[PDB]
Design an enzyme around this catalytic site. Sequence first.
Site, PDB file in Angstrom:
ATOM      1  N   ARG A   1       0.819  -1.205   0.000  1.00 45.90           N
ATOM      2  CA  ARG A   1       0.000   0.000   0.000  1.00 45.90           C
ATOM      3  C   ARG A   1       0.856   1.259   0.000  1.00 45.90           C
ATOM      4  O   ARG A   1       0.441   2.291  -0.540  1.00 45.90           O
ATOM      5  CB  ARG A   1      -0.948  -0.015   1.200  1.00 45.90           C
ATOM      6  CG  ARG A   1      -2.152  -0.926   1.015  1.00 45.90           C
ATOM      7  CD  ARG A   1      -2.909  -1.129   2.318  1.00 45.90           C
ATOM      8  NE  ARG A   1      -4.338  -1.309   2.099  1.00 45.90           N
ATOM      9  CZ  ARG A   1      -4.918  -2.468   1.814  1.00 45.90           C
ATOM     10  NH1 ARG A   1      -4.216  -3.582   1.700  1.00 45.90           N
ATOM     11  NH2 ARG A   1      -6.236  -2.507   1.639  1.00 45.90           N
TER      12      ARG A   1
ATOM     13  N   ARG B   1     -11.038  -8.491   1.279  1.00 46.55           N
ATOM     14  CA  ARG B   1     -12.255  -8.796   0.536  1.00 46.55           C
ATOM     15  C   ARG B   1     -12.821 -10.156   0.930  1.00 46.55           C
ATOM     16  O   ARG B   1     -14.005 -10.272   1.263  1.00 46.55           O
ATOM     17  CB  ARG B   1     -11.966  -8.743  -0.964  1.00 46.55           C
ATOM     18  CG  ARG B   1     -13.139  -9.120  -1.844  1.00 46.55           C
ATOM     19  CD  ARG B   1     -12.765  -9.039  -3.312  1.00 46.55           C
ATOM     20  NE  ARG B   1     -13.863  -9.450  -4.178  1.00 46.55           N
ATOM     21  CZ  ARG B   1     -13.788  -9.521  -5.500  1.00 46.55           C
ATOM     22  NH1 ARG B   1     -12.675  -9.215  -6.146  1.00 46.55           N
ATOM     23  NH2 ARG B   1     -14.857  -9.907  -6.190  1.00 46.55           N
TER      24      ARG B   1
ATOM     25  N   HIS C   1      -6.163 -18.687 -15.084  1.00 49.22           N
ATOM     26  CA  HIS C   1      -7.195 -17.827 -14.520  1.00 49.22           C
ATOM     27  C   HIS C   1      -8.566 -18.257 -15.032  1.00 49.22           C
ATOM     28  O   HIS C   1      -8.774 -18.319 -16.249  1.00 49.22           O
ATOM     29  CB  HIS C   1      -6.939 -16.368 -14.879  1.00 49.22           C
ATOM     30  CG  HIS C   1      -8.055 -15.448 -14.490  1.00 49.22           C
ATOM     31  ND1 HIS C   1      -9.031 -15.045 -15.375  1.00 49.22           N
ATOM     32  CD2 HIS C   1      -8.354 -14.859 -13.308  1.00 49.22           C
ATOM     33  CE1 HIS C   1      -9.880 -14.245 -14.757  1.00 49.22           C
ATOM     34  NE2 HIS C   1      -9.492 -14.116 -13.501  1.00 49.22           N
ATOM     35  N   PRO C   2      -9.518 -18.555 -14.148  1.00 48.09           N
ATOM     36  CA  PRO C   2     -10.842 -19.009 -14.602  1.00 48.09           C
ATOM     37  C   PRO C   2     -11.555 -17.937 -15.413  1.00 48.09           C
ATOM     38  O   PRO C   2     -11.774 -16.818 -14.941  1.00 48.09           O
ATOM     39  CB  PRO C   2     -11.577 -19.314 -13.292  1.00 48.09           C
ATOM     40  CG  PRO C   2     -10.495 -19.535 -12.286  1.00 48.09           C
ATOM     41  CD  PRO C   2      -9.388 -18.607 -12.683  1.00 48.09           C
TER      42      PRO C   2
ATOM     43  N   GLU D   1     -17.348 -22.186 -14.304  1.00 47.83           N
ATOM     44  CA  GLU D   1     -16.975 -21.705 -15.630  1.00 47.83           C
ATOM     45  C   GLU D   1     -17.912 -22.244 -16.703  1.00 47.83           C
ATOM     46  O   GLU D   1     -18.268 -21.523 -17.642  1.00 47.83           O
ATOM     47  CB  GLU D   1     -15.525 -22.079 -15.936  1.00 47.83           C
ATOM     48  CG  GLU D   1     -14.527 -21.474 -14.967  1.00 47.83           C
ATOM     49  CD  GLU D   1     -14.707 -19.977 -14.813  1.00 47.83           C
ATOM     50  OE1 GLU D   1     -14.827 -19.282 -15.845  1.00 47.83           O
ATOM     51  OE2 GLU D   1     -14.741 -19.496 -13.661  1.00 47.83           O
TER      52      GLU D   1
ATOM     53  N   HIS E   1     -21.177 -20.248 -17.090  1.00 49.08           N
ATOM     54  CA  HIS E   1     -21.120 -19.142 -18.039  1.00 49.08           C
ATOM     55  C   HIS E   1     -21.299 -19.643 -19.465  1.00 49.08           C
ATOM     56  O   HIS E   1     -22.020 -19.031 -20.263  1.00 49.08           O
ATOM     57  CB  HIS E   1     -19.792 -18.397 -17.915  1.00 49.08           C
ATOM     58  CG  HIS E   1     -19.297 -18.262 -16.510  1.00 49.08           C
ATOM     59  ND1 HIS E   1     -20.130 -17.991 -15.446  1.00 49.08           N
ATOM     60  CD2 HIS E   1     -18.049 -18.359 -15.994  1.00 49.08           C
ATOM     61  CE1 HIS E   1     -19.416 -17.925 -14.337  1.00 49.08           C
ATOM     62  NE2 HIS E   1     -18.150 -18.147 -14.641  1.00 49.08           N
TER      63      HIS E   1
ATOM     64  N   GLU F   1     -21.873 -15.223 -13.761  1.00 49.97           N
ATOM     65  CA  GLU F   1     -21.209 -15.672 -12.541  1.00 49.97           C
ATOM     66  C   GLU F   1     -22.210 -16.277 -11.566  1.00 49.97           C
ATOM     67  O   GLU F   1     -21.910 -17.267 -10.889  1.00 49.97           O
ATOM     68  CB  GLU F   1     -20.460 -14.509 -11.891  1.00 49.97           C
ATOM     69  CG  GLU F   1     -19.465 -13.812 -12.806  1.00 49.97           C
ATOM     70  CD  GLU F   1     -18.254 -14.669 -13.123  1.00 49.97           C
ATOM     71  OE1 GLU F   1     -17.974 -15.617 -12.360  1.00 49.97           O
ATOM     72  OE2 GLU F   1     -17.579 -14.393 -14.138  1.00 49.97           O
TER      73      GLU F   1
ATOM     74  N   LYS G   1     -14.599   1.409   6.009  1.00 50.33           N
ATOM     75  CA  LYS G   1     -14.160   0.088   6.445  1.00 50.33           C
ATOM     76  C   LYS G   1     -14.412  -0.108   7.935  1.00 50.33           C
ATOM     77  O   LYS G   1     -14.858  -1.180   8.362  1.00 50.33           O
ATOM     78  CB  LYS G   1     -12.678  -0.109   6.122  1.00 50.33           C
ATOM     79  CG  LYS G   1     -12.384  -0.385   4.658  1.00 50.33           C
ATOM     80  CD  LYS G   1     -12.793  -1.794   4.274  1.00 50.33           C
ATOM     81  CE  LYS G   1     -11.954  -2.819   5.016  1.00 50.33           C
ATOM     82  NZ  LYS G   1     -12.410  -4.213   4.764  1.00 50.33           N
TER      83      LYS G   1
ATOM     84  N   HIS H   1      -9.442  -4.342  -9.598  1.00 50.46           N
ATOM     85  CA  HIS H   1     -10.584  -3.742 -10.278  1.00 50.46           C
ATOM     86  C   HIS H   1     -10.502  -2.220 -10.284  1.00 50.46           C
ATOM     87  O   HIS H   1     -10.779  -1.581 -11.306  1.00 50.46           O
ATOM     88  CB  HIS H   1     -11.883  -4.202  -9.617  1.00 50.46           C
ATOM     89  CG  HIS H   1     -12.027  -5.690  -9.543  1.00 50.46           C
ATOM     90  ND1 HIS H   1     -11.304  -6.465  -8.660  1.00 50.46           N
ATOM     91  CD2 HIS H   1     -12.807  -6.546 -10.244  1.00 50.46           C
ATOM     92  CE1 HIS H   1     -11.635  -7.734  -8.820  1.00 50.46           C
ATOM     93  NE2 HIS H   1     -12.545  -7.811  -9.774  1.00 50.46           N
TER      94      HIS H   1
ATOM     95  N   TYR I   1     -20.161  -7.953  -8.408  1.00 50.01           N
ATOM     96  CA  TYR I   1     -20.110  -9.062  -7.464  1.00 50.01           C
ATOM     97  C   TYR I   1     -21.229  -8.972  -6.435  1.00 50.01           C
ATOM     98  O   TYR I   1     -21.845  -9.987  -6.089  1.00 50.01           O
ATOM     99  CB  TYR I   1     -18.746  -9.099  -6.779  1.00 50.01           C
ATOM    100  CG  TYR I   1     -17.592  -9.100  -7.752  1.00 50.01           C
ATOM    101  CD1 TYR I   1     -17.219 -10.264  -8.411  1.00 50.01           C
ATOM    102  CD2 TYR I   1     -16.882  -7.938  -8.020  1.00 50.01           C
ATOM    103  CE1 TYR I   1     -16.168 -10.272  -9.305  1.00 50.01           C
ATOM    104  CE2 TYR I   1     -15.827  -7.936  -8.913  1.00 50.01           C
ATOM    105  CZ  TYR I   1     -15.475  -9.106  -9.553  1.00 50.01           C
ATOM    106  OH  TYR I   1     -14.427  -9.114 -10.445  1.00 50.01           O
TER     107      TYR I   1
END
Lengths: 647, 647, 99
Positions: free
Chosen positions: B202, B306, B378-379, B408, B411, B435, B514, B538, B548
């Site tokens: 950070r 997250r 990566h899916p 996967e 989708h 998703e 937060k 993101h 999400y």
Amino acid sequence: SSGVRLWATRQAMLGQVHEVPEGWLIFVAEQEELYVRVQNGFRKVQLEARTSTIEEQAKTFLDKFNHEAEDLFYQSSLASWNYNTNITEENVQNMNNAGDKWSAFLKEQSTLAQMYPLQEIQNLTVKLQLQALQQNGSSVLSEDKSKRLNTILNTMSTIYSTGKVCNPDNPQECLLLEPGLNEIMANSLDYNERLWAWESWRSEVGKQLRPLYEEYVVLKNEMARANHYEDYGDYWRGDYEVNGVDGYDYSRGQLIEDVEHTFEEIKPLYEHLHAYVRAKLMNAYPSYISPIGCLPAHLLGDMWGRFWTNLYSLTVPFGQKPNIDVTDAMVDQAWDAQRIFKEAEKFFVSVGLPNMTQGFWENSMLTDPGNVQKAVCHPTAWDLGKGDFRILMCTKVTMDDFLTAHHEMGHIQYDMAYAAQPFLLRNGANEGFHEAVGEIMSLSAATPKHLKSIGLLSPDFQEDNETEINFLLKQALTIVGTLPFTYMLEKWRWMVFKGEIPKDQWMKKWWEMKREIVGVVEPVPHDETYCDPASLFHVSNDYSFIRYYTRTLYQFQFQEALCQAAKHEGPLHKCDISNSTEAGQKLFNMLRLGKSEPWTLALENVVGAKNMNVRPLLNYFEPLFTWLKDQNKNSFVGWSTDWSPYA
Amino acid sequence: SSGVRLWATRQAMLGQVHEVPEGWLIFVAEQEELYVRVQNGFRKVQLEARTSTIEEQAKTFLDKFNHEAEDLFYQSSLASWNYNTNITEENVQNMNNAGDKWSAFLKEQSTLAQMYPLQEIQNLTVKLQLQALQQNGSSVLSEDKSKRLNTILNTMSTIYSTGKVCNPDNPQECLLLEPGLNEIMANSLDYNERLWAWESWRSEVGKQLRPLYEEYVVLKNEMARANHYEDYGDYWRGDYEVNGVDGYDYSRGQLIEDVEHTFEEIKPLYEHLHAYVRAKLMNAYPSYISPIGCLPAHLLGDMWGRFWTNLYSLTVPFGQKPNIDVTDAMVDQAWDAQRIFKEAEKFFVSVGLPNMTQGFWENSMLTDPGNVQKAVCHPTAWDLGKGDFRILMCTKVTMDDFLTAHHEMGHIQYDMAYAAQPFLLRNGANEGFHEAVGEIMSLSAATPKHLKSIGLLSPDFQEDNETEINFLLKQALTIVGTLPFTYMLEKWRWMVFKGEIPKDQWMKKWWEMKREIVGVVEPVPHDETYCDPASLFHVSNDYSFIRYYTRTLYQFQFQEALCQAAKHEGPLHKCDISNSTEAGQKLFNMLRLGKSEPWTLALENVVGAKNMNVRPLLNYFEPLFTWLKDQNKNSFVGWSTDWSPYA
Amino acid sequence: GNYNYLYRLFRKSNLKPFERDISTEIYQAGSTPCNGVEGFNCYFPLQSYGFQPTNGVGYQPYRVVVLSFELLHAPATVCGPKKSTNLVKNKCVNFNFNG
């Protein structure tokens, strides 16, 4: 919603399928196909095979009236033709008796039609016919007011017809307006002789007519109020008025709007034309015409300056290149009245129109009808009814007779076009439509391409730009020359009927717009004793002069539609519609209706617009405008009202 | 009088016939049948046998575009797929070159589509497709603004990828975020080791991405403002916006309150969840997490806090009790990823969804093809077009990859489901649908019922409440735990786009949110020099993080509806949609529609709620909610924002 | 993609039975003329087929043969195999030698 959404053709449906909302029936009027507007398109709908109310009484009353009307009108029509062909006392009497019978018969039906209330009558044709009959005329006023108005009209028409002036140099030498004064105002170029003829005509006629005209106007106005009009101008504005028609109703005030709106587009072309005539006049009369002053009212080629055509001698664009004439070719080809009429008939056949009636030849006369019988040589059509079509004139081997023959034949073609319609609808939609249709046929008949096609104009003849300018300016003098004169005079009667101009300002206001709207200055001043605005035929004889203005807008638009239909290639003044059958068919569709439908609908069905405009005229005289602007880039452009030949 | 109303389908009118007044004709656009509404029923009217505009151009313009778009997108997807499965220079060239031409193709057709306005289009589908095309996006601004915005994103993408922090003990020893720093705060339980990695990244990323983030947000807002948005947050809020559809219109501002309202009722469930994690963290970090203070940022089992999935090791409800996992049984039966994907194929045919083409299987990289060529693990899903489908995932024979294969392939089944839709509409309703479909089927697959049916789990497995709570909490840490963080980060990003949070207060408000929204407090005081929100992939790469949260809300609504349709009884986490053909058919009703319909209509038809809700979330974790209250009665419920590990 | 194949997805009118259209004229959507080139309301009716082994089953290239069996005043030409049985001898049999 989801009701009937019907139009003419399927191509309209394809362009309007997105416009038609869900569930609305899609009925093709021409194709008689019914469809339903659905999600993204239309679906075929199954169709079966084609199969005492006061309004019903009115239909019986109206049709019954026709049969009587057809007979009586024929008698009046025939009595007129016999009297017109041969002016004798016996010919007068039958004309009187037939007219008295005809006039008396109409009012009885008019009153009987007024018994039927039109509010409960919903048939579009029937309702229009009844109100076309329910009109009671001057009887809406009192009899004495009707008596005064009619007798004044008899006197005012007589005074104008018999208006004779005498020169101060010789009291016994008196000359009428025609052929005495008008030839002087057209052929003679003397400053004093034209000034005297212009002044004396407006003096001995205007001063006498002014008291009669003052009473005539209010009599015409009060009946208009009695007939529910703001003025007798609105009474004449009701002629073009359309009411109750979705998408085509034309308000009477719209007539004033459109005439003024279209006139502003004519000012630039006219101003340079006015400057060019002033430029040419100052080359001939530098003292009598100021470079900035207005044109003298006595040096305009006619009594009132109505037409600048006679000024072509003094305002010739190119003296070395005269206007295209094939009259000698007619003499060379031995063409005469019957030949010219036959050629006109062939030309009407060429554009697809049906050949004219043979009975015309047996009944109507073409050349001078000798001298034992008395007749008018002016071109006059005659739709006497019951298939009786005639034209009364003296046709010689001349372009003017050749053109007017086309002008008169077009009326007859229009006459038989609406002949299928009932007698009430057996007329043009407006006063100017038939005349406009007559003019465009003559214009196409005057086209050099037509003359070259028929052999009147030799193939080796060349149409140089100078000749085209000579042609266009001569067209401008004839057509654009009278437009400002027509515009102000009709507008003058508008406000005079509306009473906008008080009695003590009728003459002053006339000269106000004369020098401003028209750029024309009176050579000597006139006061309210003079009645110069009424000194013309139509004002003296109570005729809405707007017909000339309306037809000119119509004829160019119709010609533009004709040129579009004929796919003209070249200058708009060279647009010839010869051998264009489709254009005649399209014109026939307009003409076949006559006055059965609003003139706005007929105008749009030809030119594409429901409102008259001068756009073709700008296109017609576009090369001339550039030449006039080129000629007027040096001389002053416009007109100064203050300047006057008397000051 | 009467009216006629048309119905697209007969059955819709049959259920809407009682209220129709008598006399209204009953017509159906499908059967073309005639009925007239009469007293107590309807009489069938006998019917006979069957006998430019911009929108039509717009429809044709889209279809021609679809042909070339489908072709070029297929090549772009194919070229990128080769680069992923085989990371080589030439493969990278194919991915770049095909994408560049696809990007060039997109803007060319988008510009051409701009000459087809959306207002006159009657078809919503035609208007919607052009609206996707006519979306100028960043190009609404000047060309420099788009390039520099991409320059920031390119710098954001590179810096995030190359972000490497070196341990103070060894300057040469440096670790990237993936997989170095993530493993530090997910696997290693040492507070100082996690603290150093959390602070170092950070600090390193913050000092180099904060100035870029300020400009990038401004650039994103300016194009949105020029694109008729209040901010770039509203630009992203337009994804869920619905306009022009009756009964399903959804506003961009509605997205803000729905996410806020859904989270607020989650807080009572989350506060107990936060308290238990806080209580359990004290058992491992007695001096680093207060019983009332917020959670440390790096002590959440992941990088940004997250996902609390790794916290299940430290916050397990019953460590002695085992967890639902048949990974050993996956290899006890001698299976592999190909068989796992076969079970995923078996899952779709069990729920009633039809089988897919074998072409997908022969083009999909289910296992890494050795090490000579590098295959991206990566899916991801590949809806290449023209019926081509691929899955980018290095799947192994594990339960974790078993759910990944289902996720996967979910989708892929969704992508092929709306193949009937046009290429522009060949996509999910929003960014949280594909998703959602893959997650719920995997969760249903992960249930003992699915595993026991195919022999993956022995029938002697004890489905006691002990495993119910352990499974729920692990799901809650992964799914319920990420909701407060997902909600605030998008909310924080929304205010940054809107400019509500002061630029000199982004970091404090981010942690204050937060502290308040998530009950998580940073272990080191960060000022505005840091860019902790942008430390996420993101945020730096400009990905809308609300997908999400919406997907979680959608999937639970999707899952509960399937369980209700399958007549599931008991806890919702044991619900299995396998062997329920009706559920797939019920699911497939929205899947075929894709994005043509509003997502609110899609959500209502599948679930029964037009908008998002958290009722399935309570049903899914109801045993955990009561269990959490039992464990959290001895400690504080909620959080205290003031407390921090550094104070 | 096997782009040699072309298909007319748009035609000025629906084809007659057994009628072939091979016109390459630029298909016009609106009233705007095409003048042999594409652009506004102008497209290519003979769209090129993109066919790949990875394509969906319904999108794959399928070869189709339509056998129009015309039988009219013209004498018949296309008959069947007319299967022949074996030969017998010295036995009462129903023999059919070519009718």
